[PDB]
Amino acid sequence: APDIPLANVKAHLTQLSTIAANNGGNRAHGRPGYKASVDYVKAKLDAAGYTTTLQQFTSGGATGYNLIANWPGGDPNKVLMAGAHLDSVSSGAGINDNGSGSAAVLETALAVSRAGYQPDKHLRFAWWGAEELGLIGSKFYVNNLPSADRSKLAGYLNFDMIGSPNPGYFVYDDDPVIEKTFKNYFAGLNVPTEIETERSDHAPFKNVGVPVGGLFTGAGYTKSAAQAQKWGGTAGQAFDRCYHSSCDSLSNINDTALDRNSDAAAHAIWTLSS
Numbered sequence: 020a021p022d023i024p025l026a027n028v029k030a031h032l033t034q035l036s037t038i039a040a041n042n043g044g045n046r047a048h049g050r051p052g053y054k055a056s057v058d059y060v061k062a063k064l065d066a067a068g069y070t071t072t073l074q075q076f077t078s079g080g081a082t083g084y085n086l087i088a089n090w091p092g093g094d095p096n097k098v099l100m101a102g103a104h105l106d107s108v109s110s111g112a113g114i115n116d117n118g119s120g121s122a123a124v125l126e127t128a129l130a131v132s133r134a135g136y137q138p139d140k141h142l143r144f145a146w147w148g149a150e151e152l153g154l155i156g157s158k159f160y161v162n163n164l165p166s167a168d169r170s171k172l173a174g175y176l177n178f179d180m181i182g183s184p185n186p187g188y189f190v191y192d193d194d195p196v197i198e199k200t201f202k203n204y205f206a207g208l209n210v211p212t213e214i215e216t217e218r219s220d221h222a223p224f225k226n227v228g229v230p231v232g233g234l235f236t237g238a239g240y241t242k243s244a245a246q247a248q249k250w251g252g253t254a255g256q257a258f259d260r261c262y263h264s265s266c267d268s269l270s271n272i273n274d275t276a277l278d279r280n281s282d283a284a285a286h287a288i289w290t291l292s293s
């Protein structure tokens with residue numbers, strides 16, 4: 020797999036930050052900053068060669084959207100998916116929650132085209148709407164995917180909050196093959212990981228039997244003395260002191276965590292697709 024350029028990931032975050040500022044300060048469901056975020060991401064994918072779909076739904080009397088991007092080619096009976104919710108709460112720009120995951124997934128999709136990659140399994144990426152309303156967008160996708168298509172899914176990988184300022188490195192403990200793939204990449208960096216325990220878009224896929232996995236750097240919980248010894252940072256302070264706040268801005272990101280988790284995402288996607 021290729022190394023994902025950290026500066027490219029940060030540049031997508033800067034574009035989302037400007038979008039929030041030009042649309043009343045947020046990127047929330049039912050507000051213009053969310054559809055403006057969808058338009059930015061979709062334009063990059065269309066230019067790279069992806070076949071995109073805008074999936075519309077209604078929640079709370081307002082129109083919502085999920086963006087689906089399919090890379091032409093691959094075995095139609097074995098599909099590998101990766102995703103991230105693209106909405107924020109209405110209090111701020113939601114840069115770590117969840118511009119971080121949205122940006123790592125987009126840059127991985129652009130890296131596939133730049134490398135001229137032809138995976139054995141068909142690749143499909145997704146950016147979810149209305150996750151903050153209770154996983155509304157991802158539930159709409161699973162509820163409307165015919166069972167013949169559900170059986171063709173080899174796995175779903177989720178990235179929701181991967182750039183926390185006082186980070187922990189958590190790996191979901193779900194499907195064994197997916198978990199081992201993420202854990203092995205971190206072992207190669209000599210960075211220890213812990214099981215994710217501290218409610219995201221992988222839930223509706225997991226509940227219908229699709230194998231799932233993912234990465235997380237922590238939210239409102241407090242980092243312990245032992246976690247600070249293995250990862251650095253500040254014991255006694257939250258992993259993210261700006262969770263769901265107006266301060267979840269461009270300054271609310273730890274560059275090392277964003278870089279490692281973006282690189283790990285690309286490693287897992289290459290490994291599990293060929």
Ligand SMILES: N[C@@H](Cc1ccccc1)C(=O)O
Nearest residue numbers: 116150179180217218219235
């Ligand atoms: N899904 C939560 C954050 C979270 C991510 C991953 C695991 C648990 C929680 C949110 O949108 O705030």
Ligand SMILES: [Ca+2]
Nearest residue numbers: 022023025282
């Ligand atoms: Ca990198």
Ligand SMILES: [Zn+2]
Nearest residue numbers: 116117179180
């Ligand atoms: Zn989130």
Ligand SMILES: [Zn+2]
Nearest residue numbers: 108116151263
């Ligand atoms: Zn959230």
